[PDB]
Design a protein around this ligand. Structure first.
Ligand SMILES: [Zn+2]
Length: 258
């Protein structure tokens, strides 16, 4: 409850309350293409998602989340660096105050427009997401960079749903959707060990960053920036931005599947 992205409660302050903010495995990071290591053990990533597991869309104040039923292995991520399957639970986005600079990861110092996160938990090892959330191997998140350009029709269903969750705490059913439809055509990737990018900031995530970006238009971004942080009835406070600055690598290696 004690955090946001404003001057006063934002990324530069989270350490006062969450000391792990200055940990050794924080995200996001800049990926320096000259220093990535080709690892020949990486397998191609394989996603297999069942659209019937799509459950609901909810406004959480600082962002919006699309959540999936995760009671079984109907929707999983396999391959890449992993030996176990990972069970899909959520996707959400990060954006900025301008359309040109709003991603969380950078590549060779270049910030993209926005970023899609597709989050999965380790059902092989832990009995629920709450348990898994704090363990070093607990989470697998796919990040896809979004470049302002031509409008992306694959986003329409998510954009149309925002109408029903304009204020904090609102939620709506969201069904029959396969988020693999949002990924790029090729799944060549970089990977590194890191963290959730906002409080509680656990160092529990294995990142998969796709090499290829996806498009998005300015207008599409502006719809995100139109959601409200306040509860219904209150004065309006736009969800203007939600990206954390990049964090020191601190000795970590970014591996490439290519
Ligand atoms: Zn995220």
């Amino acid at each position: 409850p004690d955090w946001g992205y404003d001057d006063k409660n934002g990324p530069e302050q989270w350490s006062k309350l969450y000391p792990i903010a200055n940990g050794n495995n924080q995200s996001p990071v800049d990926i320096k293409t000259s220093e990535t290591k080709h690892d020949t053990s990486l397998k191609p990533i394989s996603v297999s998602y069942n659209p019937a597991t799509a459950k609901e869309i909810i406004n959480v104040g600082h962002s919006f989340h699309v959540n999936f039923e995760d009671n079984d292995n109907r929707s999983v991520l396999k391959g890449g660096p992993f030996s176990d399957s990972y069970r899909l639970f959520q996707f959400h986005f990060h954006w900025g105050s301008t359309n040109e600079h709003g991603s969380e990861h950078t590549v060779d110092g270049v910030k993209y427009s926005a970023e899609l996160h597709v989050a999965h938990w380790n059902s092989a090892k832990y009995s629920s997401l709450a348990e898994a959330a704090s363990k070093a191997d607990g989470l697998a998140v796919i990040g896809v960079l979004m470049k302002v350009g031509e409008a992306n029709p694959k986003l329409q269903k998510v954009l149309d749903a925002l109408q029903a969750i304009k204020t904090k705490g609102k939620r709506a059913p969201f069904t029959n959707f396969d988020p693999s439809t949002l990924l790029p055509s090729s799944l060549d990737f970089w990977t590194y060990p890191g963290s959730l990018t906002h409080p509680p900031l656990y160092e529990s995530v294995t990142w998969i960053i796709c090499k290829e970006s996806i498009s998005v238009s300015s207008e599409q971004l502006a719809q995100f920036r139109s959601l409200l942080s306040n509860v219904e009835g209150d004065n309006a406070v736009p969800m203007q931005h939600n990206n954390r600055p990049t964090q020191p690598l601190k000795g970590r290696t970014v591996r490439a599947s290519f």
